[PDB]
Short mmCIF file of C-alpha atoms and ligand atoms in Angstrom, two decimals:
data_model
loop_
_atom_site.label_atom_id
_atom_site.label_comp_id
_atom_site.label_asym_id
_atom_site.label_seq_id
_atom_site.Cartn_x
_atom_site.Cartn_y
_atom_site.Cartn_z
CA UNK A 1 0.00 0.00 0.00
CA UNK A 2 2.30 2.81 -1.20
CA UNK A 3 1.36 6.51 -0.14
CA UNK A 4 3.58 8.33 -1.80
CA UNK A 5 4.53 12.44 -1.75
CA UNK A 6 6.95 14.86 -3.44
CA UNK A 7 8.66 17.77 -1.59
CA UNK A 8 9.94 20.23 -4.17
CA UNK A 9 13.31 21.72 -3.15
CA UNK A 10 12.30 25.02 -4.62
CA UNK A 11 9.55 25.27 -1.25
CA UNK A 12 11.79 25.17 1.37
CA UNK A 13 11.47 28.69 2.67
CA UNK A 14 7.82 28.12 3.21
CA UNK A 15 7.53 24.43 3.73
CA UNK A 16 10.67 23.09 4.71
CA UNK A 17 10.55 19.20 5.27
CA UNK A 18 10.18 19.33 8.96
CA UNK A 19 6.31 20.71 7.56
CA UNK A 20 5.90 17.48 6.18
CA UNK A 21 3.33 14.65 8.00
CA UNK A 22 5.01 11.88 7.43
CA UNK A 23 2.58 9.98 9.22
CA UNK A 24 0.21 9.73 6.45
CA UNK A 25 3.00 8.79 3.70
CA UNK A 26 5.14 5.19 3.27
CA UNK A 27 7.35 7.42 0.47
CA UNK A 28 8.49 10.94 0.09
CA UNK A 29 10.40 12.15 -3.13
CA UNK A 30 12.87 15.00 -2.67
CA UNK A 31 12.47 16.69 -6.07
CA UNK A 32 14.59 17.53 -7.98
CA UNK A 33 18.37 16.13 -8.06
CA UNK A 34 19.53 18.34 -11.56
CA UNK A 35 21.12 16.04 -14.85
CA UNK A 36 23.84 18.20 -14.86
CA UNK A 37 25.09 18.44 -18.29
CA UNK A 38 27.37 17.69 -20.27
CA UNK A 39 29.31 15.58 -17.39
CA UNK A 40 26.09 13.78 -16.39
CA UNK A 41 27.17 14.17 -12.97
CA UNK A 42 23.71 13.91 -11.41
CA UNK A 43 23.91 16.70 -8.60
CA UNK A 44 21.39 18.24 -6.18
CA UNK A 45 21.19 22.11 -7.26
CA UNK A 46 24.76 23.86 -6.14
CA UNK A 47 23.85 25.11 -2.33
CA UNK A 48 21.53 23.08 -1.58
CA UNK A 49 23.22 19.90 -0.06
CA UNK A 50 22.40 20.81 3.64
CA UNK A 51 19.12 20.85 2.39
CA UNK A 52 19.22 17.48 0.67
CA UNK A 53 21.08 15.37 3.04
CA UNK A 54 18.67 16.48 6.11
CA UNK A 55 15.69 15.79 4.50
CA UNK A 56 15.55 11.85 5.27
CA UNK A 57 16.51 12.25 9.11
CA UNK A 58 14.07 15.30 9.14
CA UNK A 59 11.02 13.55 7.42
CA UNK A 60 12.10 9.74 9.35
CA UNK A 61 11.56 11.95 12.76
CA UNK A 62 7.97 11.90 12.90
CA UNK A 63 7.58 8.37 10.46
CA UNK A 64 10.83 6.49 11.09
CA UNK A 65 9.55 3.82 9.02
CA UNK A 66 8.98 6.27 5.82
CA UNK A 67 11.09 5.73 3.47
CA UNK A 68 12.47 8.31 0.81
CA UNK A 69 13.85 8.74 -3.15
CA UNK A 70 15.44 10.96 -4.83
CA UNK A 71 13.74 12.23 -8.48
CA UNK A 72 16.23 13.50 -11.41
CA UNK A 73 14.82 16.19 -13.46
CA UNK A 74 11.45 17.07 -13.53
CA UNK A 75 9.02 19.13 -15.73
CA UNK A 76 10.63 21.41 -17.95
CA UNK A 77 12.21 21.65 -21.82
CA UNK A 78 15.50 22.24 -20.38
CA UNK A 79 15.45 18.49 -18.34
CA UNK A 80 13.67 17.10 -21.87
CA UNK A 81 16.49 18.50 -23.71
CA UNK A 82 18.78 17.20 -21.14
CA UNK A 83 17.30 13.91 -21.25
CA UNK A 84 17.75 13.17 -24.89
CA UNK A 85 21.25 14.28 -25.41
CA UNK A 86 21.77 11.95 -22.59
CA UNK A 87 20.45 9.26 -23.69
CA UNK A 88 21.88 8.82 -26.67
CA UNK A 89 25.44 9.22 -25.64
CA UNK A 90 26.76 5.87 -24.02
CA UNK A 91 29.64 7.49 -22.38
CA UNK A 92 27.42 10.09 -20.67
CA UNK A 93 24.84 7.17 -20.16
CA UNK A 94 27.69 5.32 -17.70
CA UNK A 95 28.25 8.69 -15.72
CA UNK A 96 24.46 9.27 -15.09
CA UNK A 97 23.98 5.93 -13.72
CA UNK A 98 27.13 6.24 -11.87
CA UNK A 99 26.69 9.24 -10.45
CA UNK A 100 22.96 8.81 -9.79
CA UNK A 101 23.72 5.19 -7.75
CA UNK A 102 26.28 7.34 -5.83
CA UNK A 103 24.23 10.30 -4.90
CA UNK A 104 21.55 8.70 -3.41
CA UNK A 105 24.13 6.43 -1.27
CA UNK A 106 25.77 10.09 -0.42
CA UNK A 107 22.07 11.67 1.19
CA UNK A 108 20.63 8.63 2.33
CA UNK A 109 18.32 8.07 0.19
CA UNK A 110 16.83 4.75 -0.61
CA UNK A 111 15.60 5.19 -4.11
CA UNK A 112 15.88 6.84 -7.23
CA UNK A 113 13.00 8.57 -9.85
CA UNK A 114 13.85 9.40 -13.42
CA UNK A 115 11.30 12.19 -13.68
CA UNK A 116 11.50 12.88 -18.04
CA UNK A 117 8.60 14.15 -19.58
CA UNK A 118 8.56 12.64 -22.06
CA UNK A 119 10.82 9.76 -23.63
CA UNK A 120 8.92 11.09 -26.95
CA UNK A 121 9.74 10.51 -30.48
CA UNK A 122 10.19 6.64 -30.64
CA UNK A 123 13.80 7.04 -30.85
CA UNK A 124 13.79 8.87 -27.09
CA UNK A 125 11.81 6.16 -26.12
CA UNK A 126 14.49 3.94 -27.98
CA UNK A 127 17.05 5.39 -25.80
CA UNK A 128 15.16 5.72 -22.39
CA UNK A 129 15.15 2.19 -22.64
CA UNK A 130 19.33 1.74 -22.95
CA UNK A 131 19.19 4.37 -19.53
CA UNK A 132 16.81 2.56 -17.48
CA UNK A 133 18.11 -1.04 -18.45
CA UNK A 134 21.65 -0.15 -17.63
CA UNK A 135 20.46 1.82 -14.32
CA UNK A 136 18.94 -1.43 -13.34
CA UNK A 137 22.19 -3.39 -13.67
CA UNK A 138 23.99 -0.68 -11.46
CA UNK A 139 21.49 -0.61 -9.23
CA UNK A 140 21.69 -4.90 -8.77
CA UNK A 141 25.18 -4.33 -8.81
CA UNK A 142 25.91 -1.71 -5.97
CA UNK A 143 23.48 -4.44 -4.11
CA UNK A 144 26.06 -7.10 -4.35
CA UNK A 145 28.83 -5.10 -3.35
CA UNK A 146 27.93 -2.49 -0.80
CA UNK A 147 25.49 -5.74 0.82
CA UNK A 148 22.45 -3.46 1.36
CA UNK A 149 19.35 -3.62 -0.09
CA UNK A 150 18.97 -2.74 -4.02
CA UNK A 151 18.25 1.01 -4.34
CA UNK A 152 14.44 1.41 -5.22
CA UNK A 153 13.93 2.97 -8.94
CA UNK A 154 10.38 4.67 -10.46
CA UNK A 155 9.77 6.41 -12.73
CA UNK A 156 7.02 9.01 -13.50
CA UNK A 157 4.61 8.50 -16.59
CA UNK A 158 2.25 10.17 -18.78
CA UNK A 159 -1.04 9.59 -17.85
CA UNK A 160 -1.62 7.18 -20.58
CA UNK A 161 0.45 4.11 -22.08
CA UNK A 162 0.19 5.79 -25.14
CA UNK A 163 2.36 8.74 -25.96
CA UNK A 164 -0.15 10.08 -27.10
CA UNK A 165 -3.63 8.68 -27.49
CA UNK A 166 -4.54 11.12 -30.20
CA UNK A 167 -1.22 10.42 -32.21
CA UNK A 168 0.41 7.52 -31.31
CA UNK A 169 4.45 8.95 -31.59
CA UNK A 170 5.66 5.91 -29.09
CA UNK A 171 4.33 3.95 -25.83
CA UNK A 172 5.68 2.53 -22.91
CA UNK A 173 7.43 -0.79 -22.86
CA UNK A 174 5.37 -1.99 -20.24
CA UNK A 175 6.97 -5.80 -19.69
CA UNK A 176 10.34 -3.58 -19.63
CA UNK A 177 9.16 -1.58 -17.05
CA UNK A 178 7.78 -4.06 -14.84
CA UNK A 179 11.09 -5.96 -14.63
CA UNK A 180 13.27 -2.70 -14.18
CA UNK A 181 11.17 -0.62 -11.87
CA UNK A 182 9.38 -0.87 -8.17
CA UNK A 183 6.64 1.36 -9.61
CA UNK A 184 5.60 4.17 -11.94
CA UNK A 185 4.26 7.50 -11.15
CA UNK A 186 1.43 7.61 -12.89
CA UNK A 187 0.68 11.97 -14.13
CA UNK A 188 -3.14 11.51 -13.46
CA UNK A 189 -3.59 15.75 -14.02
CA UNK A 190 -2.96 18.63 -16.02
CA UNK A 191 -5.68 17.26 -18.12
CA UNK A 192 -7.28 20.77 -18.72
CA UNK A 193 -6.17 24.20 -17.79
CA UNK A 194 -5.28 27.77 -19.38
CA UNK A 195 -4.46 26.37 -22.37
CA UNK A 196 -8.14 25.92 -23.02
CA UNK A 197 -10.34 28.94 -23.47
CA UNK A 198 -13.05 26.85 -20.73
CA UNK A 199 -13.17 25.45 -17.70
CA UNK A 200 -12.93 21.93 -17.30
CA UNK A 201 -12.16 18.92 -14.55
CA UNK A 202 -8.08 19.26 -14.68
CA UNK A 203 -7.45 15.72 -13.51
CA UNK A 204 -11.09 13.92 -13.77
CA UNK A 205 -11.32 10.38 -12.70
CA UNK A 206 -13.84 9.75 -16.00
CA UNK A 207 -16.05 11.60 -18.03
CA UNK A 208 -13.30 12.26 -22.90
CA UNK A 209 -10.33 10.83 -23.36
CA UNK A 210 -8.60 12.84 -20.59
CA UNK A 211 -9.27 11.04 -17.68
CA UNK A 212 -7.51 9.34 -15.13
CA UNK A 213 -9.67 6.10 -15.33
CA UNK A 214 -8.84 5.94 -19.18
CA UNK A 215 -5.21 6.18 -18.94
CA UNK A 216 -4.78 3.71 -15.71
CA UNK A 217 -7.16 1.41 -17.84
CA UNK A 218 -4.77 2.07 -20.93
CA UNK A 219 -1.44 0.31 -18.65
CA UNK A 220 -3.55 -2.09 -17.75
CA UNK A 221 -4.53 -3.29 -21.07
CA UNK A 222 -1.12 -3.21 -22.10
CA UNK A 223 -0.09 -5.60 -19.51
CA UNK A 224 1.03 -3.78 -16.44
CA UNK A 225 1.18 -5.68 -13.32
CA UNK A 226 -1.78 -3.43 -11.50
CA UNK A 227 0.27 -3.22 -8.66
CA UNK A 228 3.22 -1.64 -10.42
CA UNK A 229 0.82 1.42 -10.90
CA UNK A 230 1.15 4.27 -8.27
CA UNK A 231 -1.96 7.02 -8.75
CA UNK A 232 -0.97 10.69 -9.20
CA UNK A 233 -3.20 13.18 -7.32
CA UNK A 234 -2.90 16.72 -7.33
CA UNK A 235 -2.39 19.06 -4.10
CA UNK A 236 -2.98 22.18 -7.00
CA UNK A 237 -6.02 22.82 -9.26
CA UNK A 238 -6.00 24.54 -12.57
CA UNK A 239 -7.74 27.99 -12.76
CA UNK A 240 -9.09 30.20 -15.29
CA UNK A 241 -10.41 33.83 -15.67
CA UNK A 242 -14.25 33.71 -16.40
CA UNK A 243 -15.38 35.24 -19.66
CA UNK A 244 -18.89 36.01 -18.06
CA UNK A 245 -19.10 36.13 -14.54
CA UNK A 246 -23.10 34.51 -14.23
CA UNK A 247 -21.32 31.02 -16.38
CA UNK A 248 -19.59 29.62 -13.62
CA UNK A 249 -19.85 25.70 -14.33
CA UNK A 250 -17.90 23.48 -15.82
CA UNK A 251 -17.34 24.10 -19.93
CA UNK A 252 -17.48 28.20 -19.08
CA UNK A 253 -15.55 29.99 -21.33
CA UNK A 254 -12.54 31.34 -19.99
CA UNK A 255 -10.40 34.17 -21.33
CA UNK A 256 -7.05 33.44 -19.57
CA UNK A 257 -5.35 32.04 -16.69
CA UNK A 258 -6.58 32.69 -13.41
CA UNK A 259 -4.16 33.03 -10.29
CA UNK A 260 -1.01 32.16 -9.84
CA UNK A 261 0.07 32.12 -13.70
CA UNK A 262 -2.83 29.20 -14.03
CA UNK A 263 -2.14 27.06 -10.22
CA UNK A 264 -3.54 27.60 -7.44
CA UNK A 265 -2.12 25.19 -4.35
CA UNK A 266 -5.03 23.11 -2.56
CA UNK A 267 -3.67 25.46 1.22
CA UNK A 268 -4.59 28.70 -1.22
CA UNK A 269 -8.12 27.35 -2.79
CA UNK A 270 -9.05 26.62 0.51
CA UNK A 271 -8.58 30.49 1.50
CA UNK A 272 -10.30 31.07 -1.74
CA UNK A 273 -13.53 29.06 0.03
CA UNK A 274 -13.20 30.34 3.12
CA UNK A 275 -12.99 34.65 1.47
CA UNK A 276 -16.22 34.02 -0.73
CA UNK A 277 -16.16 31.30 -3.27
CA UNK A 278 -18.15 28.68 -3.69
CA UNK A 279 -17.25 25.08 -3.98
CA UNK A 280 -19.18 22.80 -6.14
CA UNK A 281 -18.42 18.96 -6.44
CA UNK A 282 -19.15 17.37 -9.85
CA UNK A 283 -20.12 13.81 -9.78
CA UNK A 284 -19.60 13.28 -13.10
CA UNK A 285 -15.96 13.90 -13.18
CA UNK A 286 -15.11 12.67 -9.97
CA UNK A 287 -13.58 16.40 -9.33
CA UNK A 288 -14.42 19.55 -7.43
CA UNK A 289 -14.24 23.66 -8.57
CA UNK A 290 -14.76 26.98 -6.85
CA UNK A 291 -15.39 30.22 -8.11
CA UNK A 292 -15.93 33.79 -7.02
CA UNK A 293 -16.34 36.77 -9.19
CA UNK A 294 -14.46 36.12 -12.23
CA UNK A 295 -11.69 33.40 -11.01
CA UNK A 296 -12.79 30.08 -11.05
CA UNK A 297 -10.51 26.70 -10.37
CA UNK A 298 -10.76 23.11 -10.93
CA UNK A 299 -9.49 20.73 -8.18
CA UNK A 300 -9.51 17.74 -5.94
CA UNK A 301 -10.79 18.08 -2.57
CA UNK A 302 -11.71 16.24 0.23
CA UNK A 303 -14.74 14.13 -1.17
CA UNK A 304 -13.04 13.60 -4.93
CA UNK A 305 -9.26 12.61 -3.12
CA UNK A 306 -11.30 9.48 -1.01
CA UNK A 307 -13.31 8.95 -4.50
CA UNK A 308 -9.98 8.50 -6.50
CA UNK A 309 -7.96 6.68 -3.46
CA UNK A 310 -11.13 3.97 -3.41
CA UNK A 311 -10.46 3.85 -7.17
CA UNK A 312 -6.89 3.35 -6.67
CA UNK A 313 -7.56 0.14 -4.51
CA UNK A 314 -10.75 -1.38 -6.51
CA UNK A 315 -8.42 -1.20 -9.17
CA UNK A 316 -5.75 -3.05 -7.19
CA UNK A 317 -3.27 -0.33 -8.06
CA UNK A 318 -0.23 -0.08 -5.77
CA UNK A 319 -1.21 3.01 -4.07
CA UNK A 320 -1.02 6.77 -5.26
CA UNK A 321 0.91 9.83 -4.72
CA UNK A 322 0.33 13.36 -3.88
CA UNK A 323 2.05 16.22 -6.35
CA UNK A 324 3.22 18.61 -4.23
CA UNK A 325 3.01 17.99 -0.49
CA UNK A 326 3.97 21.46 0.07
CA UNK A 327 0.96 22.37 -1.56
CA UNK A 328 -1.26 20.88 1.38
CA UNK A 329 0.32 22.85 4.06
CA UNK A 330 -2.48 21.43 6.93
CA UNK A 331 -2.25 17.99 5.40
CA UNK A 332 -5.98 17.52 4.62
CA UNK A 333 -6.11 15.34 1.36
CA UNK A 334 -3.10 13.40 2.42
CA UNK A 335 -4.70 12.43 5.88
CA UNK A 336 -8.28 11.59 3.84
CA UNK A 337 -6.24 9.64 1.01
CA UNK A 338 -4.32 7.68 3.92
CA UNK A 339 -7.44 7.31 6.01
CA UNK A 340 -9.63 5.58 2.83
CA UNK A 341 -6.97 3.04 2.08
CA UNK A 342 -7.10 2.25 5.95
C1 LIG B 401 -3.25 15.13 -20.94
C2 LIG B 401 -2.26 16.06 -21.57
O1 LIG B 401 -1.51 15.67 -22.48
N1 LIG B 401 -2.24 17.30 -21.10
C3 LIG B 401 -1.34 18.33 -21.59
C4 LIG B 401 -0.81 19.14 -20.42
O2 LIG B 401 0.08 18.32 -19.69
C5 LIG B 401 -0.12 20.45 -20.84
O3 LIG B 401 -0.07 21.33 -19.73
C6 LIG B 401 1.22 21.35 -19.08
O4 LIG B 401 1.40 20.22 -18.24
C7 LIG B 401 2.64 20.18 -17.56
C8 LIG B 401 2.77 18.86 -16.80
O5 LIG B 401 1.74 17.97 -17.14
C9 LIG B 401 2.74 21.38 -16.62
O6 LIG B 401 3.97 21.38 -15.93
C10 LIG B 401 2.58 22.68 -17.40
O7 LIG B 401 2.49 23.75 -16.48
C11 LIG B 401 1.32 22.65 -18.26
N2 LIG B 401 1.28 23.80 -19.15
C12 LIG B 401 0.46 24.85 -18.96
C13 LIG B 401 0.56 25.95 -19.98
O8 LIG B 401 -0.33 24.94 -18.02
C14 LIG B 401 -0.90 21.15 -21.95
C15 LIG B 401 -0.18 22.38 -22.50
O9 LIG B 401 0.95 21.99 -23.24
O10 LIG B 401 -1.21 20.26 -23.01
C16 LIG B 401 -2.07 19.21 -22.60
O11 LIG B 401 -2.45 18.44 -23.72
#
């Protein structure tokens, strides 16, 4: 029963890991370690090492049987970019893994995430597959020598197997992936937002294609092991500036993105309730939205996070995981989520 939760680094100011309840969690990812290129010598940012090697003995304090990874890259063109010149380079391939194996040894850490979004065209995926397999090795390897347990290794994923449903430009090698990895990360969000000129459920269970049902059911018919399948959940929702302030349901039309630059953080939607707006919960999608005036934001919240965590285990999934806990600040959806698999 994994219950999994990422800390970004870039939070520490306002919710440094000590914040963290890591009562309600098995796992918590310390994101992100940086690729570091062109050496490959997989680093946690320059400055932040005090940072990085506290977070375990901080976060085992009140949990001492949590356990914790470290994720390498994250979100961005830059870590894409990174990524593919990467993986294509054998030489540099042997001083990620190397490096990677070692840095997670040096912070006490007792996992790694690759956290590359995506391994898209085929030939990225082509070459993901030469990292991971050769990561794997290492990772058996350091085992036998250093006589501790193999380092865990996940991996975040698209929502779907299928990179991407609407044009199929590669897939993941699912068999591959259940031999190689502990679990994946399943992106179960970011379905809708800004982009689109209406409001929509960001990271619906069902409804559309977009849906979190739809892509877990999409591993699933590929061949994935259900419990090799980890449940993303965000702590965020997606807002949008109303076009008409009297059209405040779901399929509005929007003219922008709402506050902050599209995200709003679960902590901050929750002030948004308690200065005026009103919170709707749409059985439909499985999701929830507020609005007031002319800001309106979808979301999960305390009814759709059980909904989705009951999914989760009907399913026979492995567990889930919360993007961002620092997002959560009182620790509401993480205490339901943990709570409803209990
Ligand atoms: C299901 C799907 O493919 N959704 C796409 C979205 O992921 C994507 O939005 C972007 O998602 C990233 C992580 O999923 C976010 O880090 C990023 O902030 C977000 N971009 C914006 C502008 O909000 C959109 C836009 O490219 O496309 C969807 O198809």
């Amino acid at each position: 029963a994994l219950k999994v939760g990422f800390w970004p680094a870039y939070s520490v100011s306002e919710f440094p890991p000590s914040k963290i309840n890591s009562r309600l969690f098995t796992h918590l990812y310390y994101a992100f370690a940086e690729l570091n290129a062109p050496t490959f010598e997989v680093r946690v940012p320059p400055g932040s090492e005090k940072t990085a090697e506290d977070f375990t003995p901080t976060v085992r304090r009140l949990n001492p049987s949590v356990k914790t990874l470290i994720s390498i890259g994250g979100w961005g063109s830059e870590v894409r970019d990174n990524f593919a010149k990467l993986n294509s380079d054998a030489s540099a391939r042997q001083r990620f893994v190397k490096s990677s194996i070692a840095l997670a040894r040096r912070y006490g850490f007792h996992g790694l995430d690759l956290d590359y979004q995506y391994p898209e065209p085929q030939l990225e995926m082509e070459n993901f597959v030469k990292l991971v397999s050769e990561l794997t090795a290492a990772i058996r390897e350091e085992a036998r020598t250093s006589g501790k347990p193999r380092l865990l290794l996940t991996e975040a994923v698209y929502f779907h197997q299928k990179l991407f449903p609407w044009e199929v430009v590669t897939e993941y090698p699912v068999q591959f992936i259940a031999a190689g990895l502990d679990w994946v990360n399943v992106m179960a969000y970011d379905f809708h937002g800004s982009w689109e000129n209406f409001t929509g459920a960001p990271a619906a269970l069902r409804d559309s294609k977009f849906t979190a049902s739809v892509g877990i059911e999409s591993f699933l018919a590929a061949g994935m092991p259900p419990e090799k399948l980890v449940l993303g959940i965000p702590l965020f929702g997606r807002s949008w500036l109303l076009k008409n302030n009297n059209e405040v349901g779901i399929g509005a039309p929007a003219v922008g993105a709402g506050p902050v630059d599209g995200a709003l953080s679960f902590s901050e939607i929750q002030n948004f309730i308690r200065g005026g707006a009103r919170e709707v919960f749409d059985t439909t999608t499985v999701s929830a939205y507020a609005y007031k005036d002319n800001v309106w934001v979808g979301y999960d919240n305390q009814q759709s996070v059980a909904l989705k965590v009951q999914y989760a285990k009907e399913k026979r999934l492995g567990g889930y995981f919360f993007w961002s806990v620092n997002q959560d600040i009182d620790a509401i959806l993480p205490k339901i989520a943990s709570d409803t698999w209990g």
